[PDB]
Design a protein around this nucleic acid. Structure first.
Ligand code: MG
Ligand code: MG
Ligand code: MG
Ligand code: MG
Ligand code: MG
Ligand code: MG
Ligand code: MG
Ligand code: MG
Ligand code: MG
Ligand code: MG
Ligand code: MG
Ligand code: MG
Ligand code: MG
Ligand code: MG
Ligand code: MG
Ligand code: MG
Ligand code: MG
Ligand code: MG
Ligand code: MG
Ligand code: MG
Ligand code: MG
Ligand code: MG
Ligand code: MG
Ligand code: MG
Ligand code: MG
Ligand code: MG
Ligand code: MG
Ligand code: MG
Ligand code: MG
Ligand code: MG
Ligand code: MG
Ligand code: MG
Ligand code: MG
Ligand code: MG
Ligand code: MG
Ligand code: MG
Ligand code: MG
Ligand code: MG
Ligand code: MG
Ligand code: MG
Ligand code: MG
Ligand code: MG
Ligand code: MG
Ligand code: MG
Ligand code: MG
Ligand code: MG
Ligand code: MG
Ligand code: MG
Ligand code: MG
Ligand code: MG
Ligand code: MG
Ligand code: MG
Ligand code: MG
Ligand code: MG
Ligand code: MG
Ligand code: MG
Ligand code: MG
Ligand code: MG
Ligand code: MG
Ligand code: MG
Ligand code: MG
Ligand code: MG
Ligand code: MG
Ligand code: MG
Ligand code: MG
Ligand code: MG
Ligand code: MG
Ligand code: MG
Ligand code: MG
Ligand code: MG
Ligand code: MG
Ligand code: MG
Ligand code: MG
Ligand code: MG
Ligand code: MG
Ligand code: MG
Ligand code: MG
Ligand code: MG
Ligand code: MG
Ligand code: MG
Ligand code: MG
Ligand code: MG
Ligand code: MG
Ligand code: MG
Ligand code: MG
Ligand code: MG
Ligand code: MG
Ligand code: MG
Ligand code: MG
Ligand code: MG
Ligand code: MG
Ligand code: MG
Ligand code: MG
Ligand code: MG
Ligand code: MG
Ligand code: MG
Ligand code: MG
Ligand code: MG
Ligand code: MG
Ligand code: MG
Ligand code: MG
Ligand code: MG
Ligand code: MG
Ligand code: MG
Ligand code: MG
Ligand code: MG
Ligand code: MG
Ligand code: MG
Ligand code: MG
Ligand code: MG
Ligand code: MG
Ligand code: MG
Ligand code: MG
Ligand code: MG
Ligand code: MG
Ligand code: MG
Ligand code: MG
Ligand code: MG
Ligand code: MG
Ligand code: MG
Ligand code: MG
Ligand code: MG
Ligand code: MG
Ligand code: MG
Ligand code: MG
Ligand code: MG
Ligand code: MG
Ligand code: MG
Length: 150
RNA sequence: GGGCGUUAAGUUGCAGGGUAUAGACCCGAAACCCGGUGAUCUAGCCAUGGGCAGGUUGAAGGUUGGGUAACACUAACUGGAGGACCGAACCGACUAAUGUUGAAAAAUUAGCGGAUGACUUGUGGCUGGGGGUGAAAGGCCAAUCAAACCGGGAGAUAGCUGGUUCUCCCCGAAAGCUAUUUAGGUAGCGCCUCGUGAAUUCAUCUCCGGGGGUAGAGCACUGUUUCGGCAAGGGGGUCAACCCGACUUACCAACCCGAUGCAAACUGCGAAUACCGGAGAAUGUUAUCACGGGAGACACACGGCGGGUGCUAACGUCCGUCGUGAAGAGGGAAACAACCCAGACCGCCAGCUAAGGUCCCAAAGUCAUGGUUAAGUGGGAAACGAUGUGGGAAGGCCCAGACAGCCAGGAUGUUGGCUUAGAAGCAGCCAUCAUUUAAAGAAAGCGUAAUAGCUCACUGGUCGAGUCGGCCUGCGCGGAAGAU
RNA sequence: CACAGGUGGUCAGGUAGAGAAUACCAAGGCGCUUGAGAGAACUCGGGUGAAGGAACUAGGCAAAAUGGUGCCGUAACUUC
RNA sequence: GUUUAUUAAAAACACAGCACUGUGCAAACACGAAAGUGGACGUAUACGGUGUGACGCCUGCCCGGUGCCGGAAGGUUAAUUGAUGGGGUUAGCGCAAGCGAAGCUCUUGAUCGAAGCCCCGGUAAACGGCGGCCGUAACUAUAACGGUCCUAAGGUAGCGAAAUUCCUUGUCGGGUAAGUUCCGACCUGCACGAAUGGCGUAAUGAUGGCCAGGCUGUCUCCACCCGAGACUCAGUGAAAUUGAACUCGCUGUGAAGAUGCAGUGUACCCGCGGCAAGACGGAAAGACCCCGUGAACCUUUACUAUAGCUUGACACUGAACAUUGAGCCUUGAUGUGUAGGAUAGGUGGGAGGCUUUGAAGUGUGGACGCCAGUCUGCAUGGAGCCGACCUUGAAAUACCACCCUUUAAUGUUUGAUGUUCUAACGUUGACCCGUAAUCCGGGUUGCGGACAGUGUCUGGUGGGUAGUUUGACUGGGGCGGUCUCCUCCUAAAGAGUAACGGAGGAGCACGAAGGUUGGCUAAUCCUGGUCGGACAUCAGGAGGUUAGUGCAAUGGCAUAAGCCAGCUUGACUGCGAGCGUGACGGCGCGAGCAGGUGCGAAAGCAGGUCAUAGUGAUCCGGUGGUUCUGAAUGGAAGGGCCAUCGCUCAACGGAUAAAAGGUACUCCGGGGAUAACAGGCUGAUACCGCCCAAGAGUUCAUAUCGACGGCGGUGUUUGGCACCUCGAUGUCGGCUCAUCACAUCCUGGGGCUGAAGUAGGUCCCAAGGGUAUGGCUGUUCGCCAUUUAAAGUGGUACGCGAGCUGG
RNA sequence: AGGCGGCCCCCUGGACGAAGACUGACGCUCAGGUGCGAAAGCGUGGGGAGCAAACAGGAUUAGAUACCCUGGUAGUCCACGCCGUAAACGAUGUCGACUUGGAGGUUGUGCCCUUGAGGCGUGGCUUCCGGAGCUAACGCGUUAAGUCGACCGCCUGGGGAGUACGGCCGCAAGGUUAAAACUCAAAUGAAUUGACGGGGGCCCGCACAAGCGGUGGAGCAUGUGGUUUAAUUCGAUGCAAC
RNA sequence: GGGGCUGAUUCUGGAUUCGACGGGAUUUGCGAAACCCAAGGUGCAUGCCGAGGGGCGGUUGGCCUCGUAAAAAGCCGCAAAAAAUAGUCGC
């Protein structure tokens, strides 16, 4: 009885180029967090290591049904996965410059928990001009509706 | 074929046991309802009268004047508004003692608040009970109020309570089953009576006919579990400490073999008793079922016995089976319904006896031979101790002098290096074999800078009868501290 | 009940006081329907107290103490 | 200011000020069934209802629940409404069945029908409602911060250990020598809050809490004195109580704490004044607690009613016009199956009544208009258009018209909104008159008018008003749980046999999963083999009931009662001796026999399932059969018998067609049959002693503690039992006094010591003497101040109310 | 001075000119005082169409408690009261005297034939240029920020702070007067030169759409990034490299 | 403290994250640790004595080598910090 989660504060920040739809591997005492709607995907960026992708930093919180006692950790290098013909080429995409690949949403389709994947660009950035083209398009079309009609 | 009848003499009286409908054995409710009666107190209200002694405080307005151009504002003066103050009569009831079959079924005493107001008050009219009135407390409406009081249906009703009065004689229960808006009541049965009718009927018991699955027992099986052999392969290697790993102890590991367990929801075993059914002797008031009259009771405790609950705790709970209590007096357990003995027809200044007792209170063995106790246990309770004891079976020393006495010897190797601080036995693991054996410890025990030592272990010697220490026992000592 | 009870209106004398309060008095009234005796504990109503002052205790309840006019003097605070 | 007279003056109530809402005056509302009467001889700046309470600053979010307001397209529906239908009567056909015309009937209820409700918005100064969880900052501290789930929406203005805050005496500070109260702040507000009002606030309060001065018998600790009682003498002279008394102490027993019992100790009989521990002292049939299928009031969306309040029907109740509804004078009369001069003939005869029982041209004013055409009318003419068909699963709008999925005029025909009028009625409008009368009647006129208001019926509404249920069981009640039925065990070897004792199940499934006939016979493990895989299909081997029974558990099963295949229906009709089974109701087992089966050839077998669970009394009604009856006869609308339907009536042998709560305003009947305090009885837990040695303590078990475990004691603390007490012993603390125990707090004696001495530790003895004052708190306890030789642990109805305080 | 905006009536302040007569400095400034004083806000009542904070909803939004839309209450309106701050700006206190011009616009007046809208004059207010001269300049510039006089308030660097205490002032909101410790050494007005603008106009270039090709699709030639590496020896590391 | 509710959108039922990871099966080829024999190739050979090793050390008690007695190996410790792009920013 939980709905589709999100980590929306990335899309108008980075550059998103090509998208991939991963799976996970949940590691022992911490799944009903997602079933209840408790999550933290704050600054979750997949460090590619050993040909074996991991999520780190994300604080999926423990539940309260499972006693909060012999539970696992909120943050853990959780071993992500995804099909070989989709994984085995993205190293050449991501391993060049100040790139990481992030998590996007811990949604679930096909009765099954997921995580999204998309290659990112950088933060040391004048990230202005395509937040400027919006007000150099909306005001422009208002001005030219005014001009063409009026 | 069955089921229900024809084997049936019934009515109307009178006495009577019940059941029925009427209050239905009697007294006893809070209330519910129908008529009535009350607003002399009180609750509000209404018309018409009265009361408020004495002091204070000084509002508004008004002047005499400043103030401005008027106003505003302001100075003293007058004027006396107030749910204003202090404090009488009057009200009111806050605090405290007294008084509580007091003086009074709500008050005295001493302090207290309001006291020209939403006041108080005289007298008189109005408001009716599921109604009034209410600064509204569920307070008040005649000392009574979450529906006043007075008659009536009222003999409301009470499945609950206490009482029910003359005598003798007979028999004599139950506290259980089921079912209950049912647990405290009643019904049907089971149990006691009174009458009728009927059979060796039932009852006790020897032999005989049988079905059991309790106790006890047993582990193939449901399931349990300890250990060895058999044990795959393992997280441990002492050793790589990079390795294909030098691998093996207080480790686990299969359906496995051998042994041992336990057990209400385990049984291939299995009584004792209990019960039903036949055959037979005696015996008893036919004690037995069948019908009929009338019950009572359905709140049971203990005590033993096999058991669920509880802590093998209760004068506990809840059932089985039996005795007693209830419903049972008598004796003894000091008294003490249940315990142990025992059934009170009645009288006797009559004998025998059960249980329990036989010094005295007090009725009887100061009896006997044989023991045990020395603790006033007997006269309140143990895990545990012990040269207290009494008995018995041993076992090893025992006169080729041993048991404690009493006297001597008690070591070289070896301070073993160590590791402490010096390490001889001493602070500490090792090997303590052995030189030299009459016999003597790389040390049994102390100590402190180590020490230095010290005895002893273990023998020799002296010395002239029992020991020395383990079991089994009856009796007993301590542990054994409570409130008048 | 010959009961510390309960009810309204009319008149207010002297003397110190603001005054019908209170005090002592007049005119008028009554002296309280059981009385005598002794001077215990104790109860009630009462007076004062060495020294300490709330230690008492639920809490200064009670008691004590203040108390009248004239004049001086009089805060934070306020809707003045 | 004022209230519980007769225990409560307060923080209660009431007030002015405000906010809303109702009310157009015959008000609105209330009492009275009505007449009227208040409101008010007033008129929205007035009155009623409710909410909070002066002013000062302030009064935030939410309309989902709930109510109220408006709105009416649809759903929804009474009273009326009887069209259709459905079943019996009887003229008559029935030779005898059966159909059965009108009439009276009995039944079913299409159709017209308002409010309400469903629905549409609003409104919180209407009832009310106002969240979680998680993450980072400069590691410490939180988190402005993002995350994301639900609601209608997340408590903002101010406040906050408070009159509210348990844990809690939260923390810190001031006040104190010390402060569970107080005062200030702080947030972590279990469970503050904005008109059931928040935070301030001067003034007052017989007010709640607290601190200081001055004061004192309030106190340490009382002393005299002043009186009235109390005491003796004289006079009068009572009550509440009482089974009876020749009425001692202790220990034990005992419906369990003795003035009476058993033992023992002590006591000359009898007064007088005091004291109040005991006679469970005296009063008030215990009010707390609960059983009662007693009782009262009270509430709400508990049950049915019911005053009112509203909605419609008809009557009181009337006429013309606009709109009507079916009707109401004759049939015009429409017509596509892809088929097509294209507007086609239900059964039926097969082709013409016409043609003077008077047909069309052509232009085109209506109309079916997929332009194919047409229902074409008729405004000046004196006359022949169609029929088989051309495409024919269905031949002509060429020839009857019982006249239709389809439609018109002219009059007739009645419901509603319309409108107007007055004659019914209202007039608590005006004026005159009875007359001396503001009522009443009568008249004059004016206004309103078929509304309104009444009656009967009916719908929605409705704690304003009344009647009552609200179950029992229980190791006291409520709370929870349980209640029927099935098997085991408890169940003590026949049957039976308890608890809120132990573990489970069931409210069905099966037209085959039943029937007979013939067969067939298990899991498990190993070997071998294709994708074979850890367990599939196959072959053998062991295996020997360790599998399976449509489901729980037990007892069975191999002749199988399991697993297949073949047949087709005995999961039969009427009976049933004779038994097991319960109190009965009643469920259970059936051999054998009559009818007609099935299976197999036959002897034989089947009245269910391998058995035990899978259900429900009675009434009340509907259906079918029913030569049972049939209120005079003959029928039947109805009643019997037979088959059979509608219950989680589950509290299951069922008090009703349907039923929750509060009482500390309380009331009656009872009981220790059952509670709270106390007594008794256990004694696990508590406490206090002992026992075993891990070890600590430098070496060294016991100077001194002792983890692992043991035995035992007193009868104190928390608990269990329900014996005594409910026609009543009063219960926490403090104030007052003594007494006893001894497991000792000092004083006293001694031992051992990691005891040098001062002092210590810890046991052996010993109860005779002593055993504190303050603050906080009700407190005992507790904390702390500060003493002290020490400030003992306990029992004694947690000593002590016929002696007091009453916090 | 804020402010003042249809039309009319009533009542009324003030200005400016005509040509005189008139009293003779009665005049100027003014701390404190008194009075007015936008809009907002507050109190009492009213009326409340539109508009429209807080408020609700939709979005835009990485977020949006805003800009946009959709609705909508405080208020804006009236009357009577207090408030007494505004960029209450011409950021220029009041009164005077003088110092060259022009172009307007407003209103009043004298004369000439105004035959017609005409001609030159003196007035009054106001706008725009602009000389002398002054200001850092910007600019003002007979209405001065020029030349002088008469008083009057006001400043002594920015923050702190126009804040706190305290007094007055009112119901309040806060108006009213008005410190300091401390802490930087700049804040600051004009101008100029760059650069930039989601400011402007104007212009270019295969930079743009017009059209043609291939890149990016799979392989394959070349280089690089990274991954591996005893090492694969360095550099080229968006635009300007592969 | 007891009592109820919540423990994956199956809630009396049968996962398909097609999701590179750990463990298993099938298809597959040539090295002896996946397997074996001395003929097809071939000489001074095997082992027990005994002895030794990369500026330096270690392991299988042993991997190259050696004949009456001494010189040379694959991997591990002391050390090229063998961080390559470092986490999301400016200083
Ligand atoms: Mg028969
Ligand atoms: Mg007779
Ligand atoms: Mg009789
Ligand atoms: Mg009074
Ligand atoms: Mg009082
Ligand atoms: Mg007074
Ligand atoms: Mg007064
Ligand atoms: Mg009350
Ligand atoms: Mg009374
Ligand atoms: Mg009454
Ligand atoms: Mg009554
Ligand atoms: Mg009667
Ligand atoms: Mg009676
Ligand atoms: Mg007898
Ligand atoms: Mg029952
Ligand atoms: Mg009974
Ligand atoms: Mg009873
Ligand atoms: Mg008899
Ligand atoms: Mg057994
Ligand atoms: Mg009989
Ligand atoms: Mg009885
Ligand atoms: Mg009983
Ligand atoms: Mg019994
Ligand atoms: Mg017994
Ligand atoms: Mg027993
Ligand atoms: Mg017992
Ligand atoms: Mg008992
Ligand atoms: Mg008996
Ligand atoms: Mg007896
Ligand atoms: Mg005895
Ligand atoms: Mg006898
Ligand atoms: Mg004799
Ligand atoms: Mg005697
Ligand atoms: Mg004798
Ligand atoms: Mg003798
Ligand atoms: Mg000797
Ligand atoms: Mg007097
Ligand atoms: Mg007298
Ligand atoms: Mg005296
Ligand atoms: Mg005195
Ligand atoms: Mg004196
Ligand atoms: Mg004194
Ligand atoms: Mg004190
Ligand atoms: Mg004290
Ligand atoms: Mg006092
Ligand atoms: Mg006094
Ligand atoms: Mg008062
Ligand atoms: Mg009163
Ligand atoms: Mg009272
Ligand atoms: Mg109030
Ligand atoms: Mg609404
Ligand atoms: Mg609502
Ligand atoms: Mg309607
Ligand atoms: Mg509100
Ligand atoms: Mg609102
Ligand atoms: Mg942090
Ligand atoms: Mg609290
Ligand atoms: Mg406080
Ligand atoms: Mg509140
Ligand atoms: Mg509220
Ligand atoms: Mg005597
Ligand atoms: Mg006694
Ligand atoms: Mg007695
Ligand atoms: Mg006497
Ligand atoms: Mg006496
Ligand atoms: Mg006395
Ligand atoms: Mg007494
Ligand atoms: Mg007595
Ligand atoms: Mg008594
Ligand atoms: Mg009683
Ligand atoms: Mg009673
Ligand atoms: Mg009237
Ligand atoms: Mg009621
Ligand atoms: Mg009950
Ligand atoms: Mg209970
Ligand atoms: Mg049995
Ligand atoms: Mg038996
Ligand atoms: Mg079957
Ligand atoms: Mg067969
Ligand atoms: Mg079955
Ligand atoms: Mg008939
Ligand atoms: Mg008949
Ligand atoms: Mg008849
Ligand atoms: Mg029943
Ligand atoms: Mg019934
Ligand atoms: Mg009794
Ligand atoms: Mg009892
Ligand atoms: Mg009893
Ligand atoms: Mg108690
Ligand atoms: Mg008790
Ligand atoms: Mg005992
Ligand atoms: Mg114990
Ligand atoms: Mg020692
Ligand atoms: Mg010891
Ligand atoms: Mg008692
Ligand atoms: Mg009692
Ligand atoms: Mg009594
Ligand atoms: Mg007390
Ligand atoms: Mg002692
Ligand atoms: Mg000693
Ligand atoms: Mg003593
Ligand atoms: Mg003594
Ligand atoms: Mg005792
Ligand atoms: Mg006591
Ligand atoms: Mg005591
Ligand atoms: Mg007493
Ligand atoms: Mg009290
Ligand atoms: Mg002149
Ligand atoms: Mg000034
Ligand atoms: Mg304004
Ligand atoms: Mg207004
Ligand atoms: Mg818009
Ligand atoms: Mg200013
Ligand atoms: Mg300006
Ligand atoms: Mg200025
Ligand atoms: Mg100015
Ligand atoms: Mg110029
Ligand atoms: Mg200047
Ligand atoms: Mg100037
Ligand atoms: Mg300021
Ligand atoms: Mg520049
Ligand atoms: Mg620029
Ligand atoms: Mg082009
Ligand atoms: Mg590219
Ligand atoms: Mg390409
Ligand atoms: Mg390079
Ligand atoms: Mg270089
Ligand atoms: Mg390049």
């Amino acid at each position: 009885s939980a709905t589709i989660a999100l980590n929306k504060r990335a899309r108008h920040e980075y550059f998103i180029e090509e998208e991939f739809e991963a799976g996970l591997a949940l590691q022992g005492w911490e799944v009903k967090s997602l079933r209840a709607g408790k999550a933290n995907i704050s600054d979750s960026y997949v460090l590619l290591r050993d040909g074996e992708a991991f999520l780190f930093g994300a604080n999926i919180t423990p539940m309260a049904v499972a006693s909060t006692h012999v539970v696992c950790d909120p943050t853990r290098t959780r071993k992500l996965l995804l099909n070989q013909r989709e994984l085995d080429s993205l190293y050449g995409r991501v391993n060049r410059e100040g790139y990481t690949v992030v998590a996007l949403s811990l949604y679930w389709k096909n009765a099954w928990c997921k995580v999204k994947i998309g290659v990112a660009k950088g933060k040391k950035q004048h990230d202005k001009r395509s937040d400027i083209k919006e007000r150099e398009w909306q005001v422009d079309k208002a001005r030219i509706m005014k001009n063409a009609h009026r």
